[PDB]
Amino acid sequence: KTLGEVWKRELNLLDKRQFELYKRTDIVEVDRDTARRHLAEGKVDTGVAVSRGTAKLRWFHERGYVKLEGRVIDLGCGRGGWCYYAAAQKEVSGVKGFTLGRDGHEKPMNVQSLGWNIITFKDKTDIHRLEPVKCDTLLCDIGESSSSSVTEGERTVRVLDTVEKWLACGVDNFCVKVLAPYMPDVLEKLELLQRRFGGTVIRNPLSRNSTHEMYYVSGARSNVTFTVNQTSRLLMRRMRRPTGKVTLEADVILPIGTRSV
Ligand SMILES: Nc1ncnc2c1ncn2[C@@H]1O[C@H](CSCC[C@H](N)C(=O)O)[C@@H](O)[C@H]1O
Numbered sequence: 001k002t003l004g005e006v007w008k009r010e011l012n013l014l015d016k017r018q019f020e021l022y023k024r025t026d027i028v029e030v031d032r033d034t035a036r037r038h039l040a041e042g043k044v045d046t047g048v049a050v051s052r053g054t055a056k057l058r059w060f061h062e063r064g065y066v067k068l069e070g071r072v073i074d075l076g077c078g079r080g081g082w083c084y085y086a087a088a089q090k091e092v093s094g095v096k097g098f099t100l101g102r103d104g105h106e107k108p109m110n111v112q113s114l115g116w117n118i119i120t121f122k123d124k125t126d127i128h129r130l131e132p133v134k135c136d137t138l139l140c141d142i143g144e145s146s147s148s149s150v151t152e153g154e155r156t157v158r159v160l161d162t163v164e165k166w167l168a169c170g171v172d173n174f175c176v177k178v179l180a181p182y183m184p185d186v187l188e189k190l191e192l193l194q195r196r197f198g199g200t201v202i203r204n205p206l207s208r209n210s211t212h213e214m215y216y217v218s219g220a221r222s223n224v225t226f227t228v229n230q231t232s233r234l235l236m237r238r239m240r241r242p243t244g245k246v247t248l249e250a251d252v253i254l255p256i257g258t259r260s261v
Contacts, residue, residue, distance in 0.1 A: 003232035004182020004212050008149045010239060011210065019210075024244040028205050030055045030251040039109070047254045050109040053081030053141060054252045056206050057175065061085070065202055065219040066175040068092050070136030073166070075127040078106040080119070082139050087115030088254045092137070095119040098127050113254040128162045138163070138171045143179030145211055153183035160189050160216075167197050174199065176216040181228045190216065190224045200224060203231040209238055 014022060035048035049055065060066045069091045074083050077097030087095050092115070101107035101123030108121035127142070142159050146152045156179040163176050174197075180186055181201055190201060193216065200222040201214040214231060 002182050002184060002187070003229055003236065004180075005149055005184075007182065007212065007232050007236050007239070008152075008180075010236070012147055014239075018242075021242045021244050022239050023208065023210050024246050025209060025238045025242050026245055026247075027209055028247045028249060030206070031248045032251055035251055039111075044111040045256050047113050047256050048111075049081055049113075049252045049254070050079040050084060050111055051081035052206065053078070054085045054254075055249075056141075056204050057082045057085045057139070058252050059204055059206060060175055060202070060215065060217060060219075061089075065215075065217040066137075066139075067173045067219065068137055069173060070094075071134070072096070072137040072139065073133060073135040074098070075130075075138075075140040075163070075166070076100075076142035077108060077121065078141070079109040080121060082141060083108075083119050083121065084111065084113050084116065084254065085252070086137070086139070087119050087259070088113060089115075093118070096133070096135075097121045098125040098130060099123055100126060112258075113256055115259045117258040117260075128158065132166045132169050134169050135166075135171060137173040138166050138176070139174070140166075140176045143177045143213060145179070149180065149183060152180035153186055156180045156183065156186045157189060160186070160193065163216075164193065167193075172218070174216065174218045178214050178216050180212060181214045181224075182212050182232055187225060187228060194221070194224060201227055203227070203234075209235060 038048045068086050068089045072086045072095045074097040077099045083095050083097040199218045203214045
């Protein structure tokens, strides 16, 4: 019924070539060539990002969508792209990252970009059952794609449900992935959360066309329904007007070393 639900249905109707063409339509992504080469060679002191996540968080941070301050907690940290980005910011005093890191799930990567020493990575952790901890900045980048809109909705509502427990502890800043903001129940939950904690949902330009993911962030306040539909319209336009045109941008390079007393 929602424009996003229509988008999801049409996305699944594309043949293999149509899908490939759509995925490459008017997108922007960082060039990962150097980072991948450095990581494959075991280089840990060149400042490259462990994942594309570093550039995604940088985009939100550099324009005030989320302030990264004090005690940072990263739920579903994976390799740690958000943890390393946060650790390099002067306003951040410490970073605690949690992730599954088992049964195919990405494990934290150990590199020595600026502030690596103030990060505490913990794997074998299901954040849905992790007792909330007090922090100043709450980050969460969880949401597994599914060809089923119903499944994406269920997964998204579960993430928001868990995150609400953490926000209820009192946090100043947050950036939380919302996998399927186009689903009716998710929109309503977001409206309720906004009335309780403020913020709004924003589409990151680095996100792929094949996902409707948006992020619930603390740095702005706007009508959720409007912004989500704005994104649905953009994604539908790209599907109807394929181009396969990709734009590349420089990946993030962080300073290196420890942050000490
Ligand atoms: N219930 C759960 N508990 C902990 N981690 C989970 C989880 N469900 C998914 N994850 C992890 O959440 C991660 C999402 S991808 C996160 C990428 C990260 N922001 C970066 O910048 O590198 C994946 O590693 C996935 O394994």
